[PDB]
Design a protein around this ligand. Structure first.
Ligand SMILES: CCNS(=O)(=O)c1ccc2c(c1)CN(C)C(=O)N2
Ligand SMILES: [K+]
Length: 127
């Protein structure tokens, strides 16, 4: 029932780059999903205490959330776009694993994922 330390949002020894694709991921993809009406449950790490989900971190061992992704993008944490896309995919996957199909949180994840994929379809070529 207690929360782990959140995922790191910086790591000085980790390698990183600024790419036009990562800029797009912050300016377009994250920004669009962040403002969505269903973004709120995904804007911070799952709080197992507040939300009374005492089993959450007994099941989900690779937690991820858009608050973490936002800070990673702001902090130039990533080496490439794929590392960031992976984080979004971990967040969605965790939600589908932990919750029941048709639960409100799943409908929210599914709407955010639809939008995510629409935005990723226009990801520019690396230039
Ligand atoms: C519709 C959201 N309801 S709630 O905030 O009680 C909630 C209910 C369930 C969860 C979460 C939030 C967050 N989340 C990422 C998750 O997988 N489960
Ligand atoms: K499930």
């Amino acid at each position: 029932s207690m929360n782990p330390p959140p995922p790191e949002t910086s790591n000085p020894n980790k390698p990183k780059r600024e790419t036009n694709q990562l800029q797009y991921l912050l300016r377009v993809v994250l920004k669009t999903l962040w403002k969505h009406q269903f973004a709120w449950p995904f804007q911070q790490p799952v709080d197992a205490v507040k939300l009374n989900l005492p089993d959450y971190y007994k099941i989900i061992k690779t937690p991820m959330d858009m608050g973490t992704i936002k800070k990673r993008l702001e902090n130039n944490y990533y080496w490439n776009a794929q590392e960031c896309i992976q984080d979004f995919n971990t967040m969605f996957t965790n939600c589908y694993i932990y919750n029941k199909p048709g639960d409100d949180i799943v409908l929210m994840a599914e709407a955010l994922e639809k939008l995510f994929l629409q935005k990723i379809n226009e990801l520019p070529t690396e230039e």
